[PDB]
């Protein structure tokens, strides 16, 4: 036998940073969770008991605290390309980093109509995640989302025309409630290596912005005719919009809220028209994915 | 042996009601959890099993559908008083019932600045709930509550002056991180019944709107010289500004951040006036409660 | 306002203690969740902030350490009355402490057949749970239970006979499916201190054992006719076996499991007798309560 | 822009069946939890709002339930490949199906010393759990697993002689607590199709049966080097068991269990060999990884 594949590091590490602004006194923070794997030449660790070859899991949780100590932990683009690019280059063995980074909500509270300098509130378990790959000789991949958006609309969405067969009971519907928890993904044309992620900074928040908005908006105007065709009017204009995502990925369950039948009990009608009372079902729920490039 | 205690009923019922303004077309939604817990004189399906004591949980569920379908959901103190009152009404042997809500977040979104009329979003898992428990002969009891409000200010918190004995090595400070999940709970006069709840519905939206806002206000503000100290003042602003709420109880964890020392690391400052790098603690936490009333 | 009660602590400390025999080899580990509140003459933190009076949670973390140390962890109930104890003694102004344990199982591994002497599995999630309240001048009152014991029964179990009226749809069956998750608490006769709760240290273990035991056998072999009638059954043996218990409380979802009609896809026969596929249902879910103690 | 790839089907199926046999009357349970989805000629049900491409999430649903009705569900590699086969089949334009089934733990009871014959407890929250990929003219591809298999060693672990520099502060170690959580996964040689699949269905519960085995073995006696080392052990042995076994994976987390030193509190001694209470850590934790194929 033989190695064919490894990976080690440390997970879960959470991390919070805060910026002090002297001048006007106002404080920011930021608070991710960080996973860092690595890979290279390692194999004899596995093989031989040899731990020579093994930078300490410890030791990555040390760095990555220094490494948020001593750099912008802002965009997580930018940091995750940091935080990669310095094993491969601190370690000769080392030949990959892969740096998952999720991005909590601490948004600044506003009082009285007015901003507040230090008070913060979590509105909602929406997270903004990247993964960077970082490759010795191959560059930095970077994968951005955005996950745990939950929306619903309860009217302007459509099933209806899809195959019936003698395994269907479902009925075709002119307006359902649809509801979901949005995963987006956007995959950037690959970087050269820390200058060029640099160089394009300002585009990752940017990005991030265009494609929560474009999100919103078109699941709030489309008068959906399914799933799939709501998801891939938001990925479309997503890649219109910026010429570095090569790739938008979308996975979306479908959250089912079911009618309830009520006219055994005195005729009441809660049905089509007057259906006003449903059942959110927890499970089973439909998945539905795509990933949308250029032609 | 003998039964000193019973109580019976369905758990985790998920209700949705959509309301639809056909002047405006703008559609609002509803959805909760809801749990009906019964008392009465139910021992002998217990000792004799003798089921036809027994309002089958099944036809509970279906009681609180029908409920919701003729009656409004909002506000839910007068929901679960209808919802409680049904119960000890309808049936003879049925003394007491026990209603609990809880309140999930659908909020508008707005689309280019604009409110949408039938789009929603689930802005954090903040909940708003209530208990009531409606006894025959003894009126109606109701509390209140919000939970799962996330916050985090990141100065203007110090906690010193504490006892210092042989076990504590806790050192005083002048300047920390604070962060907590609110739950607070209003405890309501007793209603006569649900005449009197109707007369009062006005005040449970408005009550919410205040413990909320107070809690917001009062944490952001405060020069906060412990948890303790911090949560008796929204406690006390509670109370005066709503003569109907007999008592106010607060359940506070206090999730702690604590420094890292990077001096081992090339003298690295990262304590005191120079923490920037903090790593939040999942467990344990501290844990404070209080619960206030009148003179 | 006034302060009407208070309490606070540390929540959520995890502890792990081993045991090596010497003589044998054999180690042995209990891991525990633990969290401790007090009560006493602690207003003046509230209202006046007055630390002075605060035995800061942090110290309180680092007692419950030192008394795992100093003292045998096992059974938890003895462990808990020691950690009050300690409060309410070393603290003139403490009055009461309130501890909460729950054990996670550790169980040794059987390797070859043979008892392994250090490695050991979690099988399962079930925990073994105390409450105890050590309150200045009035002893300490004991809570033991056991949670989170879940089981399944394919049939003998029945459900018919329940009152029907036209809020009810359930129809009556002689043969269903019985799943639930167990939680019993069994309480304690008030204990005067210490070394009372020291005399009756062998009754803790062997009355956990009896509640587990009677609970499997009894949820097994009877026919059951609710599940109001299977957990009187329960408890009243566990009554009878001890006679230091005054109360036993059994708190128990009925986790659904539905009839899937398939008769529409070409007759096929899948209720009643025929019933073989069934949809787990995950919410909503009975929830049964009864404490009964001693006529 | 174009769809690069699609897929979309019912996740979080939940299913159980009952085997009944006449003769002795024993009775057996299969829970399981079921996603399936699909893959094919879909695309312009994203592009041209075509439902006619779609065979509803619902009919999977259905299907699921049906194929569990005439046929058996274990092993969990058959019943997957008969239900990935049955879309393929069924459906021209449909090319591809996966299938994710998680078994869930029903384990008879013994009482008294006997097996019960309809009497089930969960022991544990293992999974058994398999990946089916039928593909198209390129036959199934399976992969098992095994995973929440939690376990503990009290000694016998070592990590020592791992790289050292800047970045390090943690100590070596000649003795540690070593726990994780297991994840292995062992990966089929493709089979051409059902017929296939059915000729090696004894291996599948045996061999899983050995990877479970093995692993619990191979954790308890190695004087571990490393989780690298243990796990590397661990993969060999089931390769050489099981020719028609390609590769294997672990994925296991190093829970960490950290000394407290408790000198500062009157010179108690619980470091090194003095060590007997320890921190559970929740997080950050060692994530290893490695897949083992053939030469
Ligand atoms: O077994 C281990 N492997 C590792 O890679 C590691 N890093 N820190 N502790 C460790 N323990
Ligand atoms: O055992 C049961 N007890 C109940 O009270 C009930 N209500 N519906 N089904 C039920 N089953
Ligand atoms: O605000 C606080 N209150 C307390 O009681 C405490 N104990 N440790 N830190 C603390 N902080
Ligand atoms: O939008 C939907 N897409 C689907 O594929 C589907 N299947 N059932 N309901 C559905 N709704
Ligand atoms: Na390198
Ligand atoms: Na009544
Ligand atoms: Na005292
Ligand atoms: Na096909
Ligand atoms: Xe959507
Ligand atoms: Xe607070
Ligand atoms: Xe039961
Ligand atoms: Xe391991």
């Known amino acids: ?41 390692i194999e004899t660790s596995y093989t031989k008991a040899d731990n020579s070859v093994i ?4 030791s990555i949780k040390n760095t990555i605290y220094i490494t948020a100590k001593q750099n912008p ?37 506003d009082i009285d109509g007015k901003p507040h300098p230090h008070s913060f509130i979590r509105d909602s378990e929406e997270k903004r995640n990247v993964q960077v790959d970082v490759v010795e000789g191959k560059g930095i991949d970077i994968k951005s989302s955005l996950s745990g958006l939950t929306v619903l609309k309860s009217t302007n969405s459509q099933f209806w025309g899809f195959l019936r067969d003698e395994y269907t009971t479902l009925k075709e519907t002119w307006d359902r409630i649809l509801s979901t928890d949005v995963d987006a993904t956007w995959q950037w044309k690959n970087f050269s290596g820390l200058q060029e ?17 474009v999100t919103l908006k078109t699941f709030a105007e489309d008068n959906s005719a399914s799933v799939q065709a709501t998801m891939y009017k938001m990925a479309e204009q997503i890649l219109a919009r910026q010429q570095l995502i090569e790739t938008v990925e979308y996975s979306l369950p479908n959250k ?13 009608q809660n049905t089509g028209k007057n259906a006003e009372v449903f059942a959110p079902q927890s499970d089973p729920n439909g998945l539905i994915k795509c990933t949308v490039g250029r032609s």
Request: net charge neutral; proline share 3%.
């Open 55 to 58: 930078v300490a899991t410890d």
């Open 1 to 41: 036998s033989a190695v064919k594949a490894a990976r080690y590091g440390k997970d879960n590490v959470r991390v919070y940073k805060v910026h002090k602004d002297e001048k006007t006194g106002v404080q920011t923070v930021y608070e991710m969770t960080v996973c860092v794997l690595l890979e290279g030449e």
């Open 256 to 268: 089912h809220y079911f009618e309830i039948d009520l006219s055994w009990h005195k005729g009441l």
């Open 73 to 109: 932990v802002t965009p997580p683009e930018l940091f995750g390309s940091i935080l990669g690019t310095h094993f491969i280059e601190k370690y000769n063995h080392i030949h990959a980093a892969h740096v998952n980074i999720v991005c909590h909500r601490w948004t600044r509270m």
């Open 197 to 213: 992620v640099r160089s394009h900074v300002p585009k990752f928040d940017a990005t991030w912005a265009t494609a929560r908005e």
